Structure 1
Amino acid sequence: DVYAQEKQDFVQHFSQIVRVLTEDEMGHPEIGDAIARLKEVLEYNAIGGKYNRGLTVVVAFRELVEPRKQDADSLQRAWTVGWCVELLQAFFLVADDIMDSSLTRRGQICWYQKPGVGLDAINDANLLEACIYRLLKLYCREQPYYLNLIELFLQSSYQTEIGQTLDLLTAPQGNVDLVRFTEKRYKSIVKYKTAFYSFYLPIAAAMYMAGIDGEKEHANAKKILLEMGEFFQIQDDYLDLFGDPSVTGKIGTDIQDNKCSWLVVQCLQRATPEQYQILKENYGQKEAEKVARVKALYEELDLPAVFLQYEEDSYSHIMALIEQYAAPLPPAVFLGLARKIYKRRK
């Protein structure tokens, strides 16, 4: 609703992002072909999603800055930093689809899967990352929060990259070992790989832009947001298998990639020793027959019902945390982000 009114002005700002990014270096006509590839990469990989993360920067900025201090220019910056978060997203997703061997994303073929692209996607991805820091300098170089943002984004990338490492160490291909799929392992992985960049990053960027740079205040917002992140990854693992592809925009790969999913951790807990053997025998394989066998065990142990219940208990718990931790920040900040991910299907 608040995200709804802000969407239009955000998405439209994307022309300028691409304009400023493909001009400030176009006084060097030599790299023009590269700059054209940039425009192409940007419009394929930063466009077509829900923009939850970038909108959070924008939405939270308004609720934190006093209306007098929301000038045309100060807002411009808010939309740019919001798109910077969206580019971190694009950067990670491009690489991740390669590493996960994904077939679609946001309802189209993955960038590396487009003919003519392939493993060049790698350099495209690193470029998307570089653009974050180009924009920060072009728009915020003179701001007092400028170094805070630079360090926040880098720190955040390091974290989700430590997250990815954990994710991949836990899911060797051809190497099934249900034993390693524990609750602690799951909790660590999602906290690092999703929670920081998807939830702490946007709100904190908006905080720093609003002057709120206090260490306790960030620690407190972080307490709320790492919890929402963990809920958000669990919902994502569920959708991976049980969500509709025409809605999520992607084809799930968690069982095939031998991933430490939430479903798999929940299965191994409710598993009778004979179901354990089914799972131990059908997980992390490309065979469709064997993947359905796994999905059938999940439906048999009623994981879809367990997940729905978790969603409820989780949502009430985030709410408690917001009650305990939101001040001195407007509870509408976290409430808005929480409403946007509650009962999502994409």
Structure 2
Amino acid sequence: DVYAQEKQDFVQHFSQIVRVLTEMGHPEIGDAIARLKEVLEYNAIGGKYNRGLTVVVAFRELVEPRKQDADSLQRAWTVGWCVELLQAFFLVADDIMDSSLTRRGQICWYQKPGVGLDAINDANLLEACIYRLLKLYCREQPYYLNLIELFLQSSYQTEIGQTLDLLTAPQGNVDLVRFTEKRYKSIVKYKTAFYSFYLPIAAAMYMAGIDGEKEHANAKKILLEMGEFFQIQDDYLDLFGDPSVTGKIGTDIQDNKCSWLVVQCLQRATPEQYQILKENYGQKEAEKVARVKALYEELDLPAVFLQYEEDSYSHIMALIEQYAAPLPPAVFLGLARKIYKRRK
């Protein structure tokens, strides 16, 4: 597993990241820099680092070994950490917005005593650190502007997606007719697929001098479909995953979300089951959440997910055969192996 190979060096670059962002010229901001170090240590560390690692792995596979010198590698590990900072920004904010309880095996940052809504600022600081790192490591490289624009555009797309997520899930307002497959695909494309799948591979592409519109469009055809699958898996794991593996408690039913689970339910339900769903969805009561889960189990949605995972894998692999060239297929296969059969 190429992610295992690269992982140790990537994780150890984090001290470096923390040291370059937390230092000398302005001691008047030291208390703020100390707080940033706490935010970084609590929120950017404890995941799987798959999005950032995808940058590094892809870079190694796209760049000739002769061009993978010491400084080129520091830049690739830095840009990977930029992706992880992006994720950390997003998760901190999303946990607030979703009223989540745990994340990565610990209490959400905003739930910690003495943090609360100051987390809004902490999150945005994480976002700022991306642009600082790109400037400190990549400003003299011919891909600098391409990466700045990629991160900014990926944030915009992701924020548009999140707007669709929140709008399709108004609190205390159950209208099941909104929850369609078409709407679902739109939400997940924007909220998850661009940043989680296109972004890291595209960053590596740009670092390797692959800036062509056509090469980017082809990669995207693979990567956005991978991303859809990933978010479907995320939705399934929200309810049916083991939290000691996922590291977080699910909130989709209580938060009235347009999950893949509820879309599948709606496609299968009898009128009677529809009414049960309607009376019990989008509400905080533990027994109403439990009724919805029982309904999903009654309608064999775990088995449906397992079948969808098989079919989607196949479809993605077909897209790799179709759209990988002229890049090495391993770039996409490494990422597919990571996500398929994930229960994490």
TM-score past 0.5 threshold: yes
Any conservation in 2 of the 1:26–1:35 contact (CA below 8 Å)? no
Which of the residues 219, 233, 236 maps onto 1:238? 236
Say which SS state the counterpart of residue 82 (structure 1) adopts.
helix
Any conservation in 2 of the 1:220–1:325 contact (CA below 8 Å)? yes
What CA distance in whole angstroms lies between the structure 2 residues aligned with 1:72 and 1:192? Answer: 35
Any conservation in 2 of the 1:282–1:291 contact (CA below 8 Å)? yes
What CA distance in whole angstroms lies between the structure 1 residues aligned with 2:292 and 2:276? Answer: 7
Say which SS state the counterpart of residue 62 (structure 2) adopts.
coil
What CA distance in whole angstroms lies between the structure 2 residues aligned with 1:253 and 1:322? Answer: 34
What CA distance in whole angstroms lies between the structure 2 residues aligned with 1:93 and 1:281? Answer: 30
Say which SS state the counterpart of residue 63 (structure 1) adopts.
helix
What CA distance in whole angstroms lies between the structure 1 residues aligned with 2:39 and 2:283? Answer: 32
- For residues 297-336 of structure 1, what are the structure 2 equivalents within 5 Å? 297-336=295-334
By how many angstroms is 1:227 displaced?
A: 0.2
Deviations 1:103-143 (A, max 9, x none): 00000000000000000000000100000000000000000
What CA distance in whole angstroms lies between the structure 2 residues aligned with 1:189 and 1:95? Answer: 17
Any conservation in 2 of the 1:18–1:39 contact (CA below 8 Å)? yes
Deviations 1:152-177 (A, max 9, x none): 00000000000000000000000000
What CA distance in whole angstroms lies between the structure 2 residues aligned with 1:16 and 1:336? Answer: 26
By how many angstroms is 1:11 displaced?
A: 0.3
Deviations 1:243-298 (A, max 9, x none): 00111000000000000000000000000000000000000000011001000000
**Runs of at least 4 residues of structure 1 off by over 2 A?**
none
Deviations 1:196-247 (A, max 9, x none): 0000000000000000000000000000000000000000000000000111
Any conservation in 2 of the 1:173–1:257 contact (CA below 8 Å)? yes
Query: What is the aligned partner in structure 2 of residue 118 from structure 1?
Result: 116
Any conservation in 2 of the 1:53–1:86 contact (CA below 8 Å)? yes
Query: What is the aligned partner in structure 2 of residue 8 from structure 1?
Result: 8
What CA distance in whole angstroms lies between the structure 2 residues aligned with 1:92 and 1:163? Answer: 12
By how many angstroms is 1:26 displaced?
A: 3.3
What CA distance in whole angstroms lies between the structure 1 residues aligned with 2:132 and 2:303? Answer: 46
Identity over the aligned pairs, expressed in percent? 100
What CA distance in whole angstroms lies between the structure 2 residues aligned with 1:17 and 1:100? Answer: 29
What CA distance in whole angstroms lies between the structure 2 residues aligned with 1:184 and 1:154? Answer: 26
What CA distance in whole angstroms lies between the structure 2 residues aligned with 1:345 and 1:41? Answer: 27
Query: What is the aligned partner in structure 2 of residue 190 from structure 1?
Result: 188
By how many angstroms is 1:345 displaced?
A: 1.1
- The TM-score with structure 1 as length reference comes to 0.99
What CA distance in whole angstroms lies between the structure 2 residues aligned with 1:61 and 1:34? Answer: 34
By how many angstroms is 1:314 displaced?
A: 0.2
The aligned length equals 344
What CA distance in whole angstroms lies between the structure 2 residues aligned with 1:26 and 1:312? Answer: 54
